[PDB]
């Protein structure tokens, strides 16, 4: 499956995870896909919050999925 990724830009990443990954596995692709770093990064699945936790197949995600990247609250 190749899913895809949007950033604030707008800007279309594609993946190439699996429907029994997780998203905290996504994430960690669009770190380097794009080469940013998890510290203000949120995958984002139909404009809903996803969760480390949960999984693509879980999430109904499938291939062609876009996801959505936006930013986080601060740091410190």
Same mark, same amino acid.
């Given at each position: 499956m190749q899913i895809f990724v949007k950033t604030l830009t707008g800007k279309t990443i594609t993946l190439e995870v699996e /429907?029994? =990954?997780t998203i905290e596995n996504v994430k960690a692709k669009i770190q380097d896909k794009?080469?940013? /770093?998890? =510290?203000?990064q949120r995958l984002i699945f139909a404009g809903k919050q996803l969760e480390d936790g949960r999984t693509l197949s879980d999430y109904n995600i499938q291939k062609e999925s876009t996801l959505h990247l936006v930013l986080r609250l601060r740091g410190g």
């Open positions: /429907p029994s =990954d794009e080469g940013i /770093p998890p =510290d203000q």
